[PDB]
Amino acid sequence: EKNVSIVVAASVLSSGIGINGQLPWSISEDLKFFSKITNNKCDSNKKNALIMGRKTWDSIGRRPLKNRIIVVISSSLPQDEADPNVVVFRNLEDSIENLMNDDSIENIFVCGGESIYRDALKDNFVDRIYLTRVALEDIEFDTYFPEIPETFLPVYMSQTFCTKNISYDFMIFEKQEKLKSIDDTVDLLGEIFGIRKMGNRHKFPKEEIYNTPSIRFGREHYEFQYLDLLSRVLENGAYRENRTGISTYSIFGQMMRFDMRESFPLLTTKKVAIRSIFEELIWFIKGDTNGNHLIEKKVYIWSGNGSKEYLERIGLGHREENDLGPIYGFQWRHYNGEYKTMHDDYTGVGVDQLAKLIETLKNNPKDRRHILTAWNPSALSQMALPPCHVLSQYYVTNDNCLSCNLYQRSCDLGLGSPFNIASYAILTMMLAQVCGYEPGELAIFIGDAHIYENHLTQLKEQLSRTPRPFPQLKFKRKVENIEDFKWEDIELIGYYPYPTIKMDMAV
Amino acid sequence: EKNVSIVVAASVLSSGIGINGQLPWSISEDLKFFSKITNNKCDSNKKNALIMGRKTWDSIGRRPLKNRIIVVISSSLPQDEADPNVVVFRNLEDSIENLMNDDSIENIFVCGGESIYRDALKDNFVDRIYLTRVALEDIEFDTYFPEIPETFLPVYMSQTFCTKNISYDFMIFEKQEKLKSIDDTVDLLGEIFGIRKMGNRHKFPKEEIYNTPSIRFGREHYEFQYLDLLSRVLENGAYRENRTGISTYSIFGQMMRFDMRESFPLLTTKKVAIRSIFEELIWFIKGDTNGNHLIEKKVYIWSGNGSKEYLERIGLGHREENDLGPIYGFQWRHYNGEYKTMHDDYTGVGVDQLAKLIETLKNNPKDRRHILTAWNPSALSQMALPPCHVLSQYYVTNDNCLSCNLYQRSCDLGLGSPFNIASYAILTMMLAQVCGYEPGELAIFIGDAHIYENHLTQLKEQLSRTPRPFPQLKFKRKVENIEDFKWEDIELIGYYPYPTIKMDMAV
Numbered sequence A, B: 001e002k003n004v005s006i007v008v009a010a011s012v013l014s015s016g017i018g019i020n021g022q023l024p025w026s027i028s029e030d031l032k033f034f035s036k037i038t039n040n041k042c043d044s045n046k047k048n049a050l051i052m053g054r055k056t057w058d059s060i061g062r063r064p065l066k067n068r069i070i071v072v073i074s075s076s077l078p079q080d081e082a083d084p085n086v087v088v089f090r091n092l093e094d095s096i097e098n099l100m101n102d103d104s105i106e107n108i109f110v111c112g113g114e115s116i117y118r119d120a121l122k123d124n125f126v127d128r129i130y131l132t133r134v135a136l137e138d139i140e141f142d143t144y145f146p147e148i149p150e151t152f153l154p155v156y157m158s159q160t161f162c163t164k165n166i167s168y169d170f171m172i173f174e175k176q177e178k179l180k181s182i183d184d185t186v187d188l189l190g191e192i193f194g195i196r197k198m199g200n201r202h203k204f205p206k207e208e209i210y211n212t213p214s215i216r217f218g219r220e221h222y223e224f225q226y227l228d229l230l231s232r233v234l235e236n237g238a239y240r241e242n243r244t245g246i247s248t249y250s251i252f253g254q255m256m257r258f259d260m261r262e263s264f265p266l267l268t269t270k271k272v273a274i275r276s277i278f279e280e281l282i283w284f285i286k287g288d289t290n291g292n293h294l295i296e297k298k299v300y301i302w303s304g305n306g307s308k309e310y311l312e313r314i315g316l317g318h319r320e321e322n323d324l325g326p327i328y329g330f331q332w333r334h335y336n337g338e339y340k341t342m343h344d345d346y347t348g349v350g351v352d353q354l355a356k357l358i359e360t361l362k363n364n365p366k367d368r369r370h371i372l373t374a375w376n377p378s379a380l381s382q383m384a385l386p387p388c389h390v391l392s393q394y395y396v397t398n399d400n401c402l403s404c405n406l407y408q409r410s411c412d413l414g415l416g417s418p419f420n421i422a423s424y425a426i427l428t429m430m431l432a433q434v435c436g437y438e439p440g441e442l443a444i445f446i447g448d449a450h451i452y453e454n455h456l457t458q459l460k461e462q463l464s465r466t467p468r469p470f471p472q473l474k475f476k477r478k479v480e481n482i483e484d485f486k487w488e489d490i491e492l493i494g495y496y497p498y499p500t501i502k503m504d505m506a507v
């Protein structure tokens, strides 16, 4: 028995694959993907067979594919022995004669329209599925890819790629059937030493809290860098109290890694409020600490830490209603500046870290001191809340890309973390355009990674959703100064998330 | 054809296993390891056979081991059928009849003295070796474990454990003989997209720069967290210039993780100057920036950045010879203090972060703001060198352990990194004793991880050395204040490193 794999490129939601006898898109890299997989063989004196329907055979110009033998399923095509690279069969079952008879065929690929896909799955001929999920859904389709049967399980999901501002993935599905001593030794050592063995302090998450657990070795989509951290906290998190009335499950010392070259790290397993994230970031960039300016733009994330009852509770009753004090955006633009109120004019006072960062990224790109800090011990007592994202470093690669590292001392994985991922991604892209670079990578290093106990049912629901390709984010215009960005300048392309999940903030 | 494994506990350097008819040590957990490994079986109605010499049979009191059959090799013991749990054979080869005849034996273990080990290896009877490396060498031995033949390769090396201040490892050696489509798909995607696929920017290190490459899935010893970072830089490092004349190979965004409960992360692949590391750390704690105080104690690590030629070169010619300026230990003890010279009295000026950190660690252990920073933009111009270890956070676990996270913007993997690993480990243990806790974990997050080009032959030599168990570090007395620590108070137990490697610092 030889292998029979399905190759298909379908839309991410409705699984559309065609329109009016052709594809709904033109993605060059996806065709090169089709070519390399269908040519991938082990024996030199053998070829692969590509099965396709007649309409698909028409759509490719009715011309052969090099180094391969095309098999056309048709009820009315002549079975002429003229073309040795193209053969015609009357039904799909007969065309699977290559298995038993033809020993010159190594592997078999099904890749030819809805009619052939649906019959190849209903008759249980397919061993593996190569799916290319494309992020295009507000268009018209007339040919779809059938629903994948439950007998298949995902084993691979690539990172998100981008062609002509279109996001797409690459997945592999395997059909289900019915080193040995190293794992045993580690288990025995774990029985002897309790939590003395550090592995037992970092236990692998159980399958019941592992997002898409059938993907073991192919967890390439960088949203798994966030989802697996959720799983790691649910497994190893210590129940601990904190300044709020809501206890958490907390571990210490974690990291996440994200790409920004070919996609934008906005979570797809939950609809993330991208507008509020931006309006908070430009609020930091402008140097503003007036909490009213966010409420005037219908952004209330800082209303909890900016009520008169909260400020008098922490010893800042002399402060105005939403005067959050010297915080993010006051240490960015006026570091070590004497803070009075939020209405005063601070032009010239303090150290403008953001300005020095932009000027250093352009004049000395390979400098190792592109640092933006917000942890100022002399001003902590005056802040409405100590900074969570305390320090960030930036890096110019040899191909003119801008990467970013962030250390955040405390991380609300339910609310703050999805914001921190997107917020510092936008900041890096802003810094890249003003400095003339392209976006690079984003790494976030976390101290107290925790989950609030009132987010448990919500985050467990989020872990039940298999991720979708990351969207794209582009700027509509090039700005003179970094302060000039507006919400209308941001174009979010290809974002098809799961429904939003409500989670209450702990004050 | 059953399995024949060797179980042995030998010294780390000389491979001593016995003295005067008994063990050179008493490690309880190692006996539980011997028991669990020799009892590990698959069939309920089968037993394992334990082969041992006569003198070894004497050393265990001539009493049986539960659920197992002991096989004694002796030329003079009576072959009485009285005891069914003990059988005697006249030579080692005859006793390997367990393979052909007794189908009631599942696995075979050789574990009985130098004479049996050497004959079992010279006759090629052993399939696998379970080695427990013990860090005790300045004692007396009379029975040794033979040199492991080249036909064996290590496949596992556990973390370092500790019993009665003795460090030890657990290794597995396999004998050499004569998830398939996922790797193919990822390789094809790497051909289509160049450095567009993030995996190609983080290529797995080649075997020629991978320390002990035969250990694929068992790289548990946390010195591999440092050695693999060296391998990762040699593979992906971009050749970049910097403020010095010595270029580096640099990557961005890396992390290392170390245990501190059962061992001390002092590198064994190179003899690390631990005294200089400590004398620099207490120099930081005391708040001292006078570089002469380190030179007076024969510690010259800061002499390069504190020469009259270097200081005048970077615009500090007004400064005294070794006046390094407000640096580590001046932001620790006197944050935001106006720095004059190194001779002035700074008692009372600035924010004492170290004092507040200790007081916060004791009074509010689960607080999420145990932060010690050294990045002060207002003082960077006055420093002889901006801080490399810029910010650190501390964490109290539910079992009264103190963990530490460090963000390092720039990392000299040849010189600074071995110091940074050990230094912040010592600092965390000092903070743990003054606050009444035990050492926890150490995680180091790195920005610009690089290797200087004049360290290439040296670090490749270091990568050729298989690691040894981490040592132990204990304090001889409980101190009143953290400033009271002295070098004589530190006892380094079980440190048997490889010879030191000379590497020049880039000024």
Ligand SMILES: NC(=O)C1=CN([C@@H]2O[C@H](COP(=O)(O)OP(=O)(O)OC[C@H]3O[C@@H](n4cnc5c(N)ncnc54)[C@H](OP(=O)(O)O)[C@@H]3O)[C@@H](O)[C@H]2O)C=CC1
Residues within 6 Å of the ligand: A007, A008, A009, A010, A016, A017, A018, A019, A020, A021, A022, A023, A052, A053, A054, A055, A056, A057, A059, A073, A074, A075, A076, A077, A090, A091, A092, A111, A112, A113, A114, A115, A116, A119, A143
């Ligand atoms: N995104 C992707 O990966 C792909 C998309 N497509 C798109 O899908 C569309 C085409 O698919 P689709 O509409 O389903 O047409 P098909 O490609 O499935 O071709 C159908 C033809 O195959 C023959 N056929 C099908 N079933 C049988 C049967 N049971 N017995 C005998 N003959 C059979 C018939 O030929 P006959 O009339 O001669 O009897 C039929 O007309 C196009 O738009 C194409 O571009 C196609 C391939 C891949």
Ligand SMILES: NC(=O)C1=CN([C@@H]2O[C@H](COP(=O)(O)OP(=O)(O)OC[C@H]3O[C@@H](n4cnc5c(N)ncnc54)[C@H](OP(=O)(O)O)[C@@H]3O)[C@@H](O)[C@H]2O)C=CC1
Residues within 6 Å of the ligand: B007, B008, B009, B010, B016, B017, B018, B019, B020, B021, B022, B023, B052, B053, B054, B055, B056, B057, B059, B073, B074, B075, B076, B077, B090, B091, B092, B111, B112, B113, B114, B115, B116, B143
């Ligand atoms: N750290 C560890 O893992 C272990 C350490 N040890 C230690 O090592 C020491 C003992 O080892 P060791 O000194 O080598 O003594 P052995 O344990 O190897 O026993 C030797 C005896 O086995 C018999 N024997 C050996 N070879 C032959 C042969 N070719 N034909 C017939 N009989 C043979 C002889 O018994 P006879 O004289 O009756 O003929 C010989 O005296 C002890 O200190 C023990 O504690 C032991 C086991 C494990």
Ligand SMILES: CN(Cc1cnc2nc(N)nc(N)c2n1)c1ccc(C(=O)N[C@@H](CCC(=O)O)C(=O)O)cc1
Residues within 6 Å of the ligand: A007, A008, A009, A023, A028, A030, A031, A032, A033, A034, A035, A036, A052, A056, A060, A065, A066, A110, A111, A112, A131, A132
């Ligand atoms: C059958 N078909 C429709 C089509 C389009 N995109 C797809 N995409 C995927 N992922 N899977 C499919 N089955 C698929 N099929 C095809 C098949 C081949 C070519 C084609 O020109 N292939 C060249 C591509 C050459 C190149 O781009 O380098 C080859 O050599 O295979 C176009 C459409």
Ligand SMILES: CN(Cc1cnc2nc(N)nc(N)c2n1)c1ccc(C(=O)N[C@@H](CCC(=O)O)C(=O)O)cc1
Residues within 6 Å of the ligand: B007, B008, B009, B023, B030, B031, B032, B033, B034, B035, B052, B056, B060, B065, B066, B110, B111, B112, B131, B132
């Ligand atoms: C043959 N021998 C010497 C000895 C000591 N340490 C070793 N350590 C290792 N790693 N490997 C060996 N072969 C070894 N052998 C032995 C064998 C068994 C026991 C013993 O008492 N074993 C108990 C373990 C008792 C316990 O768990 O405390 C068992 O149930 O097997 C002591 C010494």
Ligand SMILES: Nc1nc(=O)c2c(Cc3ccc(C(=O)Nc4ccccc4C(=O)O)cc3)c[nH]c2[nH]1
Residues within 6 Å of the ligand: A273, A276, A301, A302, A305, A385, A412, A415, A416, A419, A500, A501, A502, A503, A505, A506, A507
């Ligand atoms: N404990 C604690 N956690 C914090 O995150 C935090 C912040 C920042 C912040 C970030 C995000 C939110 C928030 O509500 N996000 C949302 C989530 C889902 C759907 C919609 C939204 C939406 O905002 O529309 C609130 C606050 C300041 N102070 C804090 N304290």
Ligand SMILES: Nc1nc(=O)c2c(Cc3ccc(C(=O)Nc4ccccc4C(=O)O)cc3)c[nH]c2[nH]1
Residues within 6 Å of the ligand: B271, B272, B273, B276, B300, B301, B302, B305, B385, B412, B415, B416, B419, B500, B501, B502, B503, B505, B506, B507
């Ligand atoms: N560029 C750059 N790199 C740095 O590491 C650095 C430091 C800290 C430091 C740390 C270590 C050394 C050093 O020489 N270590 C050794 C290594 C092997 C064997 C012996 C020694 C020994 O000292 O005895 C020098 C300096 C201050 N300023 C710096 N600038």
Ligand SMILES: O=c1[nH]c(=O)n([C@H]2C[C@H](O)[C@@H](COP(=O)(O)O)O2)cc1F
Residues within 6 Å of the ligand: A242, A243, A386, A388, A389, A410, A411, A412, A413, A416, A417, A420, B368, B369
């Ligand atoms: O950007 C943010 N990210 C974040 O994770 N938090 C959460 C983390 C923690 O749950 C809470 C309070 O921090 P702490 O209790 O350490 O003072 O703020 C707040 C932000 F503003």
Ligand SMILES: O=c1[nH]c(=O)n([C@H]2C[C@H](O)[C@@H](COP(=O)(O)O)O2)cc1F
Residues within 6 Å of the ligand: A368, A369, B242, B243, B385, B386, B388, B389, B410, B411, B412, B413, B416, B417, B420
């Ligand atoms: O504790 C230290 N750790 C460290 O890694 N360096 C190295 C890193 C780098 O090679 C150099 C400073 O880089 P730069 O001056 O360009 O920021 O010092 C120096 C220390 F003092």
